[PDB]
Point group: C2
Chain length 403, copies 2
């Protein structure tokens, strides 16, 4: 089932997502080959989560689905900003697929907030195409394994990258990476499932120490050009240099990316099957890196909300597992409630019901509900993922490594 | 005046040109600021040449044209390939504009072979936007001036970049750059106009020596990732890493770019107001670098042609100054012919008429005409630019630096 269509190599595909609030398009940027396939070898035609976008690989000769993955993107978030009503922008996006033996047809799809198709691209990949850029053979970024439970075929490979660390600050980076690892494996279900993971710390160098602070006019030369003030949101620390992120990892087996930023300023970002980015020297580093990994690895939604008032239409059940609009609550955590739990669960009864249907979630105070009064996905001070987030993360771990 | 709308800074705009043979689009990639404006300060609302694409900057408050430039692109050439009928691709393109004091509206337009609009983007640039990336203040690439005739405001600044040269091969690079300079200023009108130019050699390092050869499976880590087999044409050496090219030059004043590739293999190209790329160690380096600069700086067309058979429709007068379809020959070099010069000029009379209307030009043996039997824009063996190419180049030099 894996050996019938694939070789133990990776087909890396770089795309450009372009558009504005009115129309979106996808175009191919570049095809590359990586030396090993670090992804799954089972459930090849199934998705663990829908994502905001999907990739389907089909065998050209038979037309059969041979691989599928899903994700979210910085582009799809940008579409929800005021700037997307005024200008057309382009964004880099990279996806890792198993390398096919015979020609394969790749189809990439983007969906809107109504979970409808908003952009699509279908293209044929010929495995002997001379313009498939061979990567990860030489000048592999210095790295060290923090944790090695097994080979890349049996464990989940997580790569931790250095952002804003010069070559002389790498001992601080490796210490920071060890702290992220300790924070992650102190949370269930990661704690009990630690032997399912490989953690590699990748010493990707920056010319400058620290990160770009656009609001203060302090731009720096760094490995991935990360910056605060993403979408003019002060604490939103992201990078749109997705090709540079993946080029730094070429030759190192990886499935998931965590980026550590060498700064004391508060900030971070996390996007499903894209990457996590976080401050390493702010005191809230430990809950923040785990919260962002909840997004990037877990595909979890934010459970916090604001008082003031469109990202989750109330007529649509979200695909995210830890929030509901009560359209299709049976597909969520209804099976985890007691027979007498009130729906919605009044805030006055929070102590009576550790698991409930609490109004407020996915940035809205009304119409969106979360599974517990508090969670790692709602606040930094709360010590754990709620029971529903824990089940959702365990399902992801088991999808990639078995029951 | 220049000072009425601009500051002594550059607004660098990075775009992505995307599409296929059927439809094309433009989207914004990033806005940057460079410390000085090295371009012109006169004829701000005029174009020296039409180009295959145009940029018009307007003051938002008055709607008045405050800056304009024109160009051609690798994307517009890719549109003519078989691949453009099968897939949608994206290309990086960078343009330097003077930095506005007040909000400005930028309009970028691409034209097809019928000289009609094929893609357009209109967007407002607010000079106080915090997300305008400040560049060229630190980590300025090591460089040396080969020629300094005056400051960046009075002279044409030409930058020569190193491709495929490691840090230990920079003495060879500077020798190669001196050879390119010597070849260029041994040709009229450059020779007599040498005091109108600044030439800077920029030692942009490469991890590997040489350039990528996709057909041989020899991929290299180089400054700008130049490679052979572009568009599956074996000897076509190009780079599409336009952001990396401009990032290497941030902080160094430049208007025109020449890239030298550390290889003996034959290859290169020149695209109007994009860049020249050529191999420094092939024996044809001297006439080739000058021929390509004829394209990238001069906007000149190729005067050579093939026997066998759409880039130049025969019912349209080309915008290039050294070829004609005799649709509007009066706008070309008619004023340089003697009253008795036969039109077309028979090949038997080539010695009698140094300037004529010789059939064969712009890749076609029929319907397109060139100004002399031979020229630097037709062959490598011919020693000089024809008198019409010389006048066209002189008009470009005078447009940017005065009569
Ligand atoms: Cl069958
Ligand atoms: Cl929408
Ligand atoms: Cl390794
Ligand atoms: Cl800091
Ligand atoms: Cl239900
Ligand atoms: Cl060579
Ligand atoms: Na793995
Ligand atoms: Na200048
Ligand atoms: Zn969050
Ligand atoms: Zn939760
Ligand atoms: Zn040419
Ligand atoms: Zn000529």
């Amino acid at each position: 089932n894996f050996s019938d269509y694939f070789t133990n190599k990776t087909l890396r595909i770089d795309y450009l997502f372009t558009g504005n609030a009115d129309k979106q398009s996808i175009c191919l940027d570049e095809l590359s080959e990586l030396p090993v396939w670090a992804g799954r070898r089972h459930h090849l035609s199934e998705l663990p989560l829908e994502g905001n976008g999907q990739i389907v690989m089909r065998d050209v000769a038979s037309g059969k689905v041979i691989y599928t993955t899903s994700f979210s993107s910085l582009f799809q978030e940008w579409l929800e900003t005021d700037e997307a009503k005024e200008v057309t922008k382009g964004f880099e996006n990279t996806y890792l697929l198993p390398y096919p033996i015979k020609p394969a047809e790749v189809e990439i799809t983007l969906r809107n907030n109504k979970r409808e198709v908003s952009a699509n691209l279908k293209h044929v990949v010929k495995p002997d195409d001379i313009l498939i850029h061979k990567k990860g053979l030489t000048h592999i970024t210095p790295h060290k394994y923090l944790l090695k439970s097994g080979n890349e075929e049996q464990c989940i490979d997580v790569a931790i990258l250095a952002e804003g660390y010069t070559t002389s600050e790498m001992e601080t980076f490796y210490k920071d990476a060890a702290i992220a690892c300790e924070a992650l494996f102190s949370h269930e279900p990661f704690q009990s499932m630690k032997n399912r993971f490989n953690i590699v710390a990748v010493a990707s160098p920056s010319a400058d120490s620290g990160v770009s602070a656009p609001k203060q006019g302090a731009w720096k030369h760094t490995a991935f050009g990360s910056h605060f003030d993403t979408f003019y949101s002060d604490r939103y620390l992201t990078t749109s240099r997705v090709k540079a992120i993946n080029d730094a990892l070429a030759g190192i087996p990886y499935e998931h990316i965590i980026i550590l930023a060498n700064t004391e300023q508060y900030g971070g970002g996390g996007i499903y099957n894209a990457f996590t980015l976080t401050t390493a020297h702010h005191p809230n580093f430990r809950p923040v890196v785990v919260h962002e990994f909840g997004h990037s690895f877990g595909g979890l939604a934010d459970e916090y909300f604001y008082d003031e008032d469109g990202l989750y239409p109330l007529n649509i059940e979200p695909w995210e597992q830890n929030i509901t609009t009560r359209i299709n609550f049976a597909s969520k955590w209804e099976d985890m409630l007691t027979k007498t739990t009130p729906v919605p669960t009044p805030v006055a009864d929070k102590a009576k019901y550790p698991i409930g249907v609490y109004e407020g979630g996915g940035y809205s105070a009304k119409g969106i509900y979360r599974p517990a009064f508090d969670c790692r996905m709602r606040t930094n001070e709360y010590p754990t993922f709620c029971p529903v987030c824990q089940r959702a993360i365990q399902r992801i771990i088991e999808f990639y490594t078995g029951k």
